[PDB]
Amino acid sequence: FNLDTEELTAFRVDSAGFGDSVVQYANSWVVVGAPQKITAANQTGGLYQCGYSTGACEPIGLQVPPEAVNMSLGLSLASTTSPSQLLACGPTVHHECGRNMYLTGLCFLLGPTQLTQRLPVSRQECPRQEQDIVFLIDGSGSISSRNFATMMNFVRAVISQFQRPSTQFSLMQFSNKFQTHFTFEEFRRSSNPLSLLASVHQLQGFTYTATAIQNVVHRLFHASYGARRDAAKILIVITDGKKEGDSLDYKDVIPMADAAGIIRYAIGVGLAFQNRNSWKELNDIASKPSQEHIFKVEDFDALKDIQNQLKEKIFAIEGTETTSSSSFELEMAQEGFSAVFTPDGPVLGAVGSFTWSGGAFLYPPNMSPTFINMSQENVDMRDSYLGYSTELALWKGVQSLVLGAPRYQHTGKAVIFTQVSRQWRMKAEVTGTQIGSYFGASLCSVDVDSDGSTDLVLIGAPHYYEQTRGGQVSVCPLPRGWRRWWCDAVLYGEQGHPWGRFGAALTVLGDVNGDKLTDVVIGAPGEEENRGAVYLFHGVLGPSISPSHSQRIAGSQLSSRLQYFGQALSGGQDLTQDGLVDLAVGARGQVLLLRTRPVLWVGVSMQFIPAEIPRSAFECREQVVSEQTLVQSNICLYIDKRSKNLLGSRDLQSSVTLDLALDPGRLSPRATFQETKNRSLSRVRVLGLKAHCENFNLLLPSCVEDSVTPITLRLNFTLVGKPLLAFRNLRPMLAADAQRYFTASLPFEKNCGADHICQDNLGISFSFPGLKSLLVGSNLELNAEVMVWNDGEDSYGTTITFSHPAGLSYRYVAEGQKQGQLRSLHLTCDSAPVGSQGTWSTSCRINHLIFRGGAQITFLATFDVSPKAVLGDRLLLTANVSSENNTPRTSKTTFQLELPVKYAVYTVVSSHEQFTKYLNFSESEEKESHVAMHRYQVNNLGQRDLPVSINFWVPVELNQEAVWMDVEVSHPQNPSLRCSSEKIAPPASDFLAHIQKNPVLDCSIAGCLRFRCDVPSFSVQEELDFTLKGNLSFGWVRQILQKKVSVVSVAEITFDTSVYSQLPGQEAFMRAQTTTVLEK
Amino acid sequence: QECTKFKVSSCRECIESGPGCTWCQKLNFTGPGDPDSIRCDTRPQLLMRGCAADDIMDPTSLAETQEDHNGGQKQLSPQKVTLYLRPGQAAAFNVTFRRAKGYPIDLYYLMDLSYSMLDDLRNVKKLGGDLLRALNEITESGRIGFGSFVDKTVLPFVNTHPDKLRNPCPNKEKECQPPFAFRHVLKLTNNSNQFQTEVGKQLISGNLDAPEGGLDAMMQVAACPEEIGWRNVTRLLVFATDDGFHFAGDGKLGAILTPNDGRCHLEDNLYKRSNEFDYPSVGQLAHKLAENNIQPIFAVTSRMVKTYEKLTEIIPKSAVGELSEDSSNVVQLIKNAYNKLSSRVFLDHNALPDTLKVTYDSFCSNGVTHRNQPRGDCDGVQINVPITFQVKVTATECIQEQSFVIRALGFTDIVTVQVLPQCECRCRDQSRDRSLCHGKGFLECGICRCDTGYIGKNCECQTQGRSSQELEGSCRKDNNSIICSGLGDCVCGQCLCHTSDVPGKLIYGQYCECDTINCERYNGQVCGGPGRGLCFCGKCRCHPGFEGSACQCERTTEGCLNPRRVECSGRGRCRCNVCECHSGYQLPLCQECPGCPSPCGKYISCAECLKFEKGPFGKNCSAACPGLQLSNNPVKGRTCKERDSEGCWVAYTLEQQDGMDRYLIYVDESRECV
């Protein structure tokens, strides 16, 4: 609520795209991208460096490399703090590979203590394509040697167009024999390959075309002859006539050429190929489609005409086996599309990589970059954009990357990766819901309590469609442990804006009001015809975020010239150097700084001298208003408990205006102020840290109609400390969720009788109906049934107060629908921290009613128990009862009740999949024993670092025969070698019959080994892996006279059940089971 | 039935206290010790107390059906409904829909013209005869238009190097044209010769980024009746492709952030500005096609159908069908489109302001018992078959007069509905009897209404004056209560509750016993805040769409339901847009129990049952594996691998869907033995 829309700074700069992206840099500058600015010939992208003191912006003088062409820099921005670093990107770097154009990505990495780096260091080299091409030469005698020479010069003609080393050739001549004139290996090594074409002479002879082809496929395209492993394989056959005398059919040989993946081109020379049958033979020589692969040549003259276009045809190379698809890799990743620093090093977003599946690059400190993405196993990730959005999640130590995929199956998805061993893997994933919702468009990690660890991540979807409002943000708790990631809460914008783009931009503004909880900003630049608006949200206690905004600043409210306000957000830094965080917001043509205002927390102390109005004063003496009685009100104001953001000057002095009001909102003001004739008094006083306390004198008349309703004094107050000494600082303000109206009661003494003394006697006593043990986090409400009774005076303003520790406090409950003899009663309560170390007092007035001196009343009081309430192992709460007439005596009515306290945990253990199920043997080798392994998997899913003890049961001896043998517990990772073993004699039973029905061997019949491995501190989210290993003997099976026996071990998690109790229901999950099968 | 008093100083304020609150006007019904509030109660209570029935004012909500003249059709009625709507009292009227009359029809074909569509292009070039032949079996004189799409022409969507921009199709060919977003092939017309003249005429083209920029097309389609023209009559579109589609947020890849204008910026019948605007959002066109009343048909490859299937819930007026790589059934497809497109009847409404709510019953003529859903929706409704949409209108406030339209989706028929508030009941006035209230006020339906300085059942007293002790035996609830309960300086046997000038603090009641604050709190607000509900005398009365002791929850269950539309898988149940998932099944929708003993080992027999037809469950199969369906294709779930009846490692994927012990299996046809 404290974002200041009055005293802002606005940087409007007419460079194309100025403000489409912006980040806070180095606690000094707001750095603005302008992706479409024309800085030079065919160069786009402009960067600006604005400062608050100046109020104007300067362009950043980068030496920008020519190899990258219209990157459009500024489109992507990022910044960090460890030392100050700016990372700028234009990920539309145009890159020409002759005929084709690509978008590689180039980022700059700047710093005030360093010189500018460039990521990736290498400029992206063109793909190239390794091709291996064999010419097959008909050398038969039907070809004139003047024609043969024309054809061979056509061969050098063609080879001259194929630049090696991407292209290699090999040559064979054929007829009635076959002549390898050079291998691929030889073509590569020569400094003038063409010289080998010269050293060749015609064979003459018959025509064995098919044999020559079979000869090529199994020889020239083998790696022994220099053929390259992964290379496009092409065979060019040139001939002047049919195969004739060929002992092999094309039908016989062709399959190996296709089986290996070799393109078959046919060049037929002469009118011998004009007719039906010769066309069909060319078809068998060439590959289908036969038009693409056959070319009819008139003499040996037209040969040179097709040359260039046959060139063109072979250059048109592509995979054809799976419908000539458009399957890519790292050509158009647009690396650096989404940028996000980490402690390991920068991370750049790969989007179009691997046919727009995506990923991202980590750049460790001055060493080999690594590429995060899902494996090629996950087919469905094509065309997703995984890496469009990238953000860092950080728990106590290990880093994690979240990446957003606008298009995952047209809906959206975001995926958490972490590091298994040294290798990145998917930790967990979560999807969008509405198709075209564009889930994953935005990413922001939120540390709600500022413990240094990301508590949850916000995920945008700014074109989400509902009839009235456009966008949303998913509030997703971090899973920890390899478990399903889920999302808790959906946010929305002020509706009436179906395409407002809510969830476009995000940013953590930090702690803004002083409450130790995090506040975040959300962009909706499409609202109000794309005028734009910004939302401010507060982080709830615990891991979640408020279902409602606490401030919505539409740029339309800010200015008549604002479009796309909130397109970009970067919050978190003291750019103005005035002590508080600032918010940087981009809009179409300008970037704005918004400031938080200080949020002061005022303490209010109210008391009267004396406690009550004695009849001595209230009584009449026949003269109206004679000898008015003097009573003092003493109020203290202090400003404390939430200084937090501030200290010293400005935290101190702050002037405040006071308004006192005697008997307010009533017709008959029964007191007045001595300082001024009137029920009301106002004055201007000075607060600093320790309170300001003041006596105010009340004149109450002699004759006063109402001596029952206590006289009430109320406190309206407002800050008027306009000139505070430092920073020319903003208007300090008061928490708008806090209260500004405060009351105090001046009761009267009451006539219990003209000849009666008045002693009030009240007693109180409460219980907790139905309650068994108390479990923090399972039991969230505490239901107190308070009985209170009157054995004395009639009680006016009956007031019950409770003593309870900070972790719980009273929640008003309503009951209704005729039900019960129960608490239908109206009343008023107040909780307030009191004392030295951690307790509170909740104080409750029965109003409307006079608690009569012989009746009792029982009523209900419910206390919300924080699931993270720190109570100790015992909870004690107390109860005081009194009237408005203030307990004039000694022994206290206090009733108190103290309980044992248990805390919730969530522990699970499971059978692992890597177990030797079904061992075997058969008739013969019973003496043989075989290595058997069972494995169990345990995980602390709860909230508390509790110690545990892991227990295992393993059949070792059945009726004297070894079953398992030499079992040990292997605990590899975190090898606290403590395990303990105890042999256990088995429940004496009729084991033939017992195994007969349900042939399973477990500890019910088997002498067992029990393993106890004590975990001294099974901290949350920790995983442990335990394995049971030992040779399973076969010899005992004959004892039981069955063929199909199985063998089972059990695991059970134990802990101190007096201190901790596992969450209800989900309690079976700490006892698990794994089975191996024996078969004769 | 039910009446809780808010401040009751007149007939109107009695009415604003709720639907069941009625007001007795009988003079001196007020007992000398029974003050004015008692006149506001349920009608049975006022009658039991002796109030004449004709003196009980009870404005009731009603609907007035003013049907629009004569001539035309008997398809949608009534055409004008005027509402006299009382807060909290539902005004329900009945809408009859009986489409029988056929109407003309315009069909506009949208052609993916990429390298993958040549086998479709040659075929559809020659079909214009069959198309008119099939249309005119049902409608009279159908019409045919044509446009085509590839993608945005800038990198990264199609290659922009001059040689490739020249021949974008594979180098293997000419007979291709430079890449384009949306080209316009002239107008819908009455000639399949004209169809041939211009449709056979133009060339196929090509793309780089696999998804199709066809949403730029449909936005330009719905924006250029000046350049295309549609008849108001049925307006159909056929989106046809082998590929997927681009949408909003993708244009950032080409450094073009500005979202779609929606304005025809057309030059020479081609989308020229397309590289300067992002793709429209999915909902952006669901809305724009609804504005101009267009039903898209999705003529896509079998491998895109599931994703186009999902587009019928964002735009209800659309149809989805699978068809061949040939386009060899686009006739049968469009026959099926119209058949089940016209089999749906949808009834929705204009933008209701927050003050109002409209809900629907929907009686399907084929026996579907259905009531209480915020959508008029029935299926399979034939020809000339009347169905029923009961329109229930309920308002919160004493609203301003206001008009809105309820419309059938797919048509330009309009039912104009007008809303009048029913707040001020009818009474006499200050011209009748200025003697009672002593000339310091006037009279309305019984009780005197007093001037600003006067009070009392007959305005006799004045605000600057006394009280009375024996009257203060009535000016308090009972012997053991406080006079006015505190919070009131008592006058003349009635209480005058105090002023607390703080937000939303009123003290009210016959004895100032109630307030607008001291109710249950949700989020950090009184009754969850003013949006979610209101606070009256210790209890929350929640607004439409909310319920709970503090308006804690939303009436909506859509939050507990999965895409299959079942609450909390089949493993939990629904409480406030939240599932409570039994055992280890996890949030949100209770699908997955990432922790349960994975059930592979007990489905050995079942897997080899169903693929390999062997194992112990031969002849036993179906009954012995009842929760399991077998899938032709790989499934998503749990990897299993284990030894069958003979010792072969059968590998299969086991995917639990909605229910207890209910699965899909993909079995690898390969065994693995030794």
Ligand SMILES: *[C@@H]1O[C@H](CO)[C@@H](O[C@@H]2O[C@H](CO)[C@@H](O[C@@H]3O[C@H](CO[C@H]4O[C@H](CO[C@H]5O[C@H](CO)[C@@H](O)[C@H](O)[C@@H]5O[C@H]5O[C@H](CO)[C@@H](O)[C@H](O)[C@@H]5O)[C@@H](O)[C@H](O[C@H]5O[C@H](CO)[C@@H](O)[C@H](O)[C@@H]5O)[C@@H]4O)[C@@H](O)[C@H](O[C@H]4O[C@H](CO)[C@@H](O)[C@H](O)[C@@H]4O[C@H]4O[C@H](CO[C@H]5O[C@H](CO)[C@@H](O)[C@H](O)[C@@H]5O)[C@@H](O)[C@H](O)[C@@H]4O)[C@@H]3O)[C@H](O)[C@H]2NC(C)=O)[C@H](O)[C@H]1NC(C)=O
């Ligand atoms: C997330 O990111 C990951 C990783 O970044 C992506 O996963 C990767 O996908 C890429 C897909 O393109 C893969 O790149 C291809 O790699 C081929 C060779 O792969 C590389 O690795 C070689 C060895 O790796 C395997 O083996 C090691 C052990 O040695 C093992 O540790 C690995 O895990 C890996 O294991 C494989 O096998 C197992 C089981 O078999 C399987 O589970 C795995 O998934 C793996 O498949 C290594 O030797 C290579 O290095 C050299 O070789 C290159 C050859 O071109 C050379 O250029 C390099 O300079 C280097 O010297 C290589 O690093 C490679 O063949 C592919 O090449 C095709 O595509 C390129 C373009 O990328 C084209 O230009 C080529 O022309 C070629 O296409 C042509 O040929 C094919 C057919 O290939 C011939 O063989 C047939 C017989 O098999 C013949 O009949 C036929 O006629 C052909 O002659 C045609 O189909 C084409 O149409 C065309 O004609 C390509 O570069 C990469 O390996 C893989 N990574 C891993 C770990 O698997 C994910 O995709 C990404 N996520 C998403 C969602 O996208």
Ligand SMILES: *[C@@H]1O[C@H](CO)[C@@H](O[C@@H]2O[C@H](CO)[C@@H](O[C@@H]3O[C@H](CO[C@H]4O[C@H](CO[C@H]5O[C@H](CO)[C@@H](O)[C@H](O)[C@@H]5O)[C@@H](O)[C@H](O)[C@@H]4O)[C@@H](O)[C@H](O)[C@@H]3O)[C@H](O)[C@H]2NC(C)=O)[C@H](O)[C@H]1NC(C)=O
């Ligand atoms: C990187 O950033 C640079 C910034 O400088 C970009 O440079 C701009 O690039 C564009 C091209 O993408 C230039 O576009 C221009 O084309 C304008 C009109 O286009 C129309 O005219 C063409 C004309 O060609 C035919 O007609 C003439 C008639 O004289 C004949 O000579 C020709 O042979 C053709 O028959 C048509 O072909 C076309 O279809 C359109 O109708 C024109 O106004 C411009 O002068 C220029 O030609 C733009 O001007 C460039 N600006 C600058 C300052 O360089 C560059 O594009 C970016 N990178 C990439 C890869 O594009």
Ligand SMILES: *[C@@H]1O[C@H](CO)[C@@H](O[C@@H]2O[C@H](CO)[C@@H](O[C@@H]3O[C@H](CO)[C@@H](O)[C@H](O)[C@@H]3O)[C@H](O)[C@H]2NC(C)=O)[C@H](O)[C@H]1NC(C)=O
């Ligand atoms: C139980 O209820 C009783 C009755 O209201 C509470 O007693 C009150 O306790 C407060 C302190 O919380 C006393 O205020 C004190 O005033 C003296 C005046 O000199 C001052 O020196 C102290 O520092 C303190 O401010 C108050 O006088 C006292 N009133 C009565 C009638 O006993 C009691 O506090 C409740 N229980 C607990 C645990 O506080």
Ligand SMILES: *[C@@H]1O[C@H](CO)[C@@H](O)[C@H](O)[C@H]1NC(C)=O
């Ligand atoms: C620079 O821009 C011109 C167009 O003005 C373009 O022809 C040229 O290819 C661009 N860059 C290079 C490296 O040639």
Ligand SMILES: *[C@@H]1O[C@H](CO)[C@@H](O)[C@H](O)[C@H]1NC(C)=O
């Ligand atoms: C012994 O175990 C092997 C696997 O290691 C299994 O294939 C075989 O079936 C077992 N023996 C017999 C006789 O089945």
Ligand SMILES: *[C@@H]1O[C@H](CO)[C@@H](O)[C@H](O)[C@H]1NC(C)=O
């Ligand atoms: C234990 O088992 C392993 C492998 O199963 C085998 O090599 C070894 O000989 C066995 N030892 C005994 C004592 O049975």
Ligand SMILES: *[C@@H]1O[C@H](CO)[C@@H](O)[C@H](O)[C@H]1NC(C)=O
């Ligand atoms: C048809 O509807 C259009 C709006 O798309 C409108 O311009 C036209 O007036 C309507 N037809 C007639 C005959 O008025």
Ligand SMILES: *[C@@H]1O[C@H](CO)[C@@H](O)[C@H](O)[C@H]1NC(C)=O
């Ligand atoms: C068929 O299944 C039943 C239990 O479902 C089992 O008792 C019976 O043995 C099975 N039959 C065969 C031939 O395996």
Ligand SMILES: [Ca+2]
């Ligand atoms: Ca935290």
Ligand SMILES: [Ca+2]
């Ligand atoms: Ca805060």
Ligand SMILES: [Ca+2]
């Ligand atoms: Ca600042």
Ligand SMILES: [Ca+2]
């Ligand atoms: Ca096709």
Ligand SMILES: [Mg+2]
């Ligand atoms: Mg020859």
